[PDB]
Design a protein around this ligand. Sequence first.
Ligand SMILES: Nc1ncnc2c1ncn2[C@@H]1O[C@H](COP(=O)(O)OP(=O)(O)O)[C@@H](O)[C@H]1O
Ligand SMILES: [Mg+2]
Ligand SMILES: [Zn+2]
Length: 430
Amino acid sequence: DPERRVRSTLKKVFGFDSFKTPLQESATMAVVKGNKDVFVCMPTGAGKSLCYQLPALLAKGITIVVSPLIALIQDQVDHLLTLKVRVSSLNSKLSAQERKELLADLEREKPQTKILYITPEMAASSSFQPTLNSLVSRHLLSYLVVDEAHCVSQWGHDFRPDYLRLGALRSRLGHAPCVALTATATPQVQEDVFAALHLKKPVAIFKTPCFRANLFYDVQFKELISDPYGNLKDFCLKALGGCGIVYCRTREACEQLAIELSCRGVNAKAYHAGLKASERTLVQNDWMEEKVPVIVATISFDKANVRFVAHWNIAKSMAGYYQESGRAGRDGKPSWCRLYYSRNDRDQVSFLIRKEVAKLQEKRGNKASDKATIMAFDALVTFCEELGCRHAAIAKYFGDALPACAKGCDHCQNPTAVRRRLEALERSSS
Ligand SMILES: Nc1ncnc2c1ncn2[C@@H]1O[C@H](COP(=O)(O)OP(=O)(O)O)[C@@H](O)[C@H]1O
Ligand SMILES: [Mg+2]
Ligand SMILES: [Zn+2]
């Protein structure tokens, strides 16, 4: 009865009566089985570390975990140690005796070390190769875990050439299943992970869908609104009856909107990097304690009663838009997400990204991530100019199945209304 073995370890070691979600449960059970290569794709804070930390304790041998930096490794090592777990870390920070003590333990016929954290540079080093081959030869390797697996991809936010060497390492240890985990949900990133880590097919996939049922999405065209500040004021008031957010691009527009909304009868405090750090925490504290309902911001600081998120200007990427609008309705109660779109604002953001790209190119030459940045923006322009379900467009971008939008977006609420606003936009060009 492995379910019972898992359930007892969950309580006695990790001190938990249940799994956070059933997907965390299915993922953990699939890693325990040990018959296939596993891919875990869940949001940050969804309990991905347990999906591999728990099975490692129930396996006969050692689990090797690859992670990008020592700072993040140390946090994971310090955490497991308090649970009285036999966790170790082979890195550059180790003193002469420390490394000698750890290398000796691994050379024992029955080593004490159950979980070993290493950086990719260390995994692929010729000096680590005698240790690894001995473990493979003695059938002492139970799992190979690749955390932050999106690091293999130039289509992700954190490309690391060191992660590309991990494919050849994985190929050398066939007996041991491989576990790959990330929060990045795009299909190109998933495809890069499967190919770069030389994963064995069929891969067991545990993917949290990006769909958020309680969010009402709409797109309004600033060009066709006689009183723009009046529309934002209406939207802000109607959504309440908690708190709400308004995003904009400039410090100028951030100040204009904060004063402009306070005049209409909706108390708004401007938040940007131009202000003093003393004032930053002050404005933050007041929005958190509901003294001020609206925060107009260009930058960010997690409030649970966010009833609205309004984007005064188009965001820089589809992933950025998903994350910023995603700050709404964390309590599960109904919330509203509006993106105010104009072709001039599109031309402005596009120009800004192209300069930022040329600045990186002047600094370090050409890279394949240069094209990804333009495509991440053009996917958001497509969403703004598209006629279709707002939730189905997000699902398609993140490789999810069609979501059950029960009149949960402007297009689904009334497709004719979205069509008339779009026709007026297309005609205005002539
Ligand atoms: N079954 C569980 N029940 C409750 N909390 C859990 C459970 N499993 C893990 N957690 C906790 O969830 C938090 C976030 O998990 P973590 O592994 O850091 O997530 P991720 O890698 O997805 O960002 C941690 O503080 C962890 O202890
Ligand atoms: Mg993690
Ligand atoms: Zn819809």
